[PDB]
Amino acid sequence: VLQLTIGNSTITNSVVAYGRWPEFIQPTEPDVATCRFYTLDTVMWGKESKGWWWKLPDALRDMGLFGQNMYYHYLGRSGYTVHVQCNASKFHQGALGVFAIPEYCLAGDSDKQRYTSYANANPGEKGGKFYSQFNRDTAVTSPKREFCPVDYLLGCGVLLGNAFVYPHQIINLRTNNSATIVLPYVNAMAIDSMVKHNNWGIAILPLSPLDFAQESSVEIPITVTIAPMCSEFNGLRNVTAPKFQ
Amino acid sequence: VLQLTIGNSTITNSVVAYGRWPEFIQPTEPDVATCRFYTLDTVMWGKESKGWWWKLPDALRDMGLFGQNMYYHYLGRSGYTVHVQCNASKFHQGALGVFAIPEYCLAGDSDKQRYTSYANANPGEKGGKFYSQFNRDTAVTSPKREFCPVDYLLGCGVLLGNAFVYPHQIINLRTNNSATIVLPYVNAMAIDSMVKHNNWGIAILPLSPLDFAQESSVEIPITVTIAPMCSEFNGLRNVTAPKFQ
Amino acid sequence: VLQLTIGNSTITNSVVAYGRWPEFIQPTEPDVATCRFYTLDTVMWGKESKGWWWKLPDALRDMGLFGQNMYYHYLGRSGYTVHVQCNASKFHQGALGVFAIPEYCLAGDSDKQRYTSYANANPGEKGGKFYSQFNRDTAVTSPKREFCPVDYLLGCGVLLGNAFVYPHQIINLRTNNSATIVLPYVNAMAIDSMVKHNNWGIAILPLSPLDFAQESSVEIPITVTIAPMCSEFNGLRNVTAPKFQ
Amino acid sequence: TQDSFTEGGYISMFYQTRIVVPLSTPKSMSMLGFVSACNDFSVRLLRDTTHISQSA
Amino acid sequence: QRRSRSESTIESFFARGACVAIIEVDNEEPAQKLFAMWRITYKDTVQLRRKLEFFTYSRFDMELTFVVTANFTNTNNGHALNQVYQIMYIPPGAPTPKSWDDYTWQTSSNPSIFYTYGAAPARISVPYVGLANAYSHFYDGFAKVPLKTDANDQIGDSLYSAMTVDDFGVLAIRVVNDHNPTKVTSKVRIYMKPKHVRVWCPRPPRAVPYYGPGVDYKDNLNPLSEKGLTTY
Numbered sequence A, B, C: 001v002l003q004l005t006i007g008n009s010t011i012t013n014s015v016v017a018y019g020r021w022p023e024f025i026q027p028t029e030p031d032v033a034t035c036r037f038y039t040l041d042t043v044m045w046g047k048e049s050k051g052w053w054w055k056l057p058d059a060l061r062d063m064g065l066f067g068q069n070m071y072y073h074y075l076g077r078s079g080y081t082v083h084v085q086c087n088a089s090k091f092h093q094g095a096l097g098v099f100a101i102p103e104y105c106l107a108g109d110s111d112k113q114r115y116t117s118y119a120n121a122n123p124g125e126k127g128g129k130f131y132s133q134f135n136r137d138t139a140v141t142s143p144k145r146e147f148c149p150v151d152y153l154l155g156c157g158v159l160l161g162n163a164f165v166y167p168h169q170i171i172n173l174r175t176n177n178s179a180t181i182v183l184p185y186v187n188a189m190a191i192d193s194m195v196k197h198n199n200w201g202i203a204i205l206p207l208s209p210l211d212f213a214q215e216s217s218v219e220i221p222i223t224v225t226i227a228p229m230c231s232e233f234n235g236l237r238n239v240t241a242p243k244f245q
Numbered sequence D: 001t002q003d004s005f006t007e008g009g010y011i012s013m014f015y016q017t018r019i020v021v022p023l024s025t026p027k028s029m030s031m032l033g034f035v036s037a038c039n040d041f042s043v044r045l046l047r048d049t050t051h052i053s054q055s056a
Numbered sequence E: 001q002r003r004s005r006s007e008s009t010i011e012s013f014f015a016r017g018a019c020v021a022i023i024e025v026d027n028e029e030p031a032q033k034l035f036a037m038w039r040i041t042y043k044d045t046v047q048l049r050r051k052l053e054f055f056t057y058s059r060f061d062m063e064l065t066f067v068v069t070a071n072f073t074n075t076n077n078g079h080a081l082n083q084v085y086q087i088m089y090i091p092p093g094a095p096t097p098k099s100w101d102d103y104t105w106q107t108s109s110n111p112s113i114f115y116t117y118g119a120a121p122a123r124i125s126v127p128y129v130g131l132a133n134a135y136s137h138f139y140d141g142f143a144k145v146p147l148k149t150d151a152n153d154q155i156g157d158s159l160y161s162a163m164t165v166d167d168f169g170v171l172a173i174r175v176v177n178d179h180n181p182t183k184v185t186s187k188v189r190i191y192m193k194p195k196h197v198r199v200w201c202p203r204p205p206r207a208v209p210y211y212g213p214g215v216d217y218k219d220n221l222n223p224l225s226e227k228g229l230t231t232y
């Protein structure tokens, strides 16, 4: 609706998660190097798309100096401002539910429990995608150790309809083309490791299927832009180099 | 003499160059990520060593988050605290002149003027070494385009004896084993690019040859530790990746 | 560091055990006959020395009038000032841990428990010596009934490294050549028999082995001088004559 | 107890320059290490130590 | 407004004691269960687990109540005298029993309850013993990160959503009495009651059967039943 300027990045309803604005608690605080909007890779919303999911701060691990501070320091905390952009014409119809889940633990694909690997559990800016059904992994010799989120189960054994208990925003193409959620730092500790722990999960679900006129196939872009807010790090040491394979 | 604590690094006369302490002038200022002592690779002072030279901030280009901020931002400024360590026994004799030259331009090795390449002019933490005489480059087909510093000419056409006009410290093994120079930011501009311009040059010359008892060959280590002070950067953009070859 | 004058004996950091100075509680108090430094027999610290131990007041049982008062009276109390002297050159290296253990009970050498004899448990000014390993007594016919202290076990089943919980002083030849510990009277009673009960144990352990230049065998003297302080006796009767054999 | 979630960090030691000794001096020396807690230190949830055991 | 919400409060919502574990302890001639070690958690049962997982973070003081029920096993006329059960709490790091008469049962510093059979169920209270500022029902992360310099992948391999292997220790339950000539089998049921409960970040309730200590789902993934669109 109005100008949204952070650092050196400006974006032309916005919901504050849990009514709490990001806030600070000698932590290293880059007021400019990290407090800015980083744009994730655009995804394509089609008529056969089940959904998308990203993990924060994992999605910003390779975003400018924020990732460098995240890997160099031991433990850091950061709020976020997520902005989802999806522009469509008056003749397009659809709705996206954008949910910011605290501790968005997801279910695996194998009978073995909690067997998902770090590489698969931390996809980065590409994120992942939900599925209509639960596909059980059958590669016993070389298990994929990847999540198997289910659209209507939200990937966590709960019903999608109740996901609105989480902070949420609905992009309904007939009325609005963008959503904005301001997430504070949510954790059981005032500050925690970012490389191993993800504080937030952004799930975008097509509540209503996309459609345009009488066209058989229609696809429109969705772009996610995340701004770290009041991010502070502590425990400076040699750089961490996670094995992503 | 006394404890020297900066950030998370502590070192157990110290001269302030030009009697000016490093000082600040929305620049990005990492108060902890950059304000700390980084130790350069140790060199070996022998009886046939002519000298060593490093360029600042080039020597700290790959030192933690200071290098990341240097490459990510457009223009930055930083003071320095250089600490040279060389421990020897009571029976060792020698003296090192440590000079902090502003704009320490060096002479080339070819008849072509100002033909030194960026890769050779920016050695990094390894630095370079002076030479007794001037060796003219003869590889016309593939010129080396490297400096040819001369010990008694200081590598700049001036006499070594007058180099004491610069900020300096003498490590005389009989009285002291370490030297400490505090350099403010010196430039014609309040802030300038660090990737292309080096503000300081640290030259260590063996004023008196090293000797120990009646031993024919003696070598002792020299370790340089540099702490950026009041370093602030501006002009954040994609990361710079210089071609060092 | 400074003059240390007691009675008619003067010695040219000093630690007060438990921060308590020796103090008095009609006890017989010789202010001069007993309050003076008595020098024990010098021992020789070599490269194959495991340690030494003495028991107080047993070590002063034959030292001037202090021993006479100790044997004549029934029960007496006395603080001590222990001064260990070990002078070495700049080219000697080593370290001695001098520990004042309250109730320094030691382990025996036989399978029989608490079978150590009074004669062996009270060596006098000569003291005893620790051993690298535990040598089990095998003379069933004539058991020696002597202690078998172990250097790393401190002779009491505890680790040597934790012995610093006791009052201690480190004679490091590179920095200091003497140690001084001031022990108050420590016991479960305000005054107790001295002939049967030893209040303190002085253990000197070579924390770092002695070495000198490249010499194969080097030995230097260690001299212990103990000054009774605020010693008072009570229960005068005929003289006690312990059987030392 | 050993736990990667409450891991505390690492302690390392390196030669900054070297050990330099003259002639007629031992070229090999020994260093000792001591550990202590600061005034901010605190412990919680008393338990039984695993160091001492008794044959039953 | 005269109708109140006193019973919908978080404290009232958890003010009931929920069974979290059933432990079998047998006394017989000494492959055997003379002592049973049970790891402390509410995830062995679904009801209290589901109630707690209504939220993401919690902080509560716990109250444990032990109900012991003993029975004979194929006794003809062999009988037993009243038994005493020892329930010893072993926090992480403390030694664990290897037998029913091990030295660890001395309980020099490990708290223990000696319960006499036929008496009231044994009740004690525990404060908030969390390392962090609140309990984490859901942990979107690992405890180890696999690094490029790791020699093998197993160094950094860790279970997803697992914080610590030994969360809060175990309870070791034995029968202090020596073996009677006839076997006696007892079941100890542990009932956990949160108190002074505080919760944060509400979550939707579980809709499908639990499968393990995590959010994993395996079967019965079709909860909703058939119903007409326009049928009342």
Ligand SMILES: CCCCCCCCCCCCC/C=C/[C@H](O)[C@H](N)CO
Pocket (backbone or CB within 6 Å): E040, E041, E042, E062, E087, E088, E089, E111, E112, E113, E124, E126, E129, E135, E136, E137, E167, E168
């Ligand atoms: C004989 C005395 C018994 C003493 C019992 C002490 C056990 C201590 C356990 C306290 C907490 C256990 C249950 C609460 C923690 C929850 O599982 C958290 N959500 C952890 O994820």
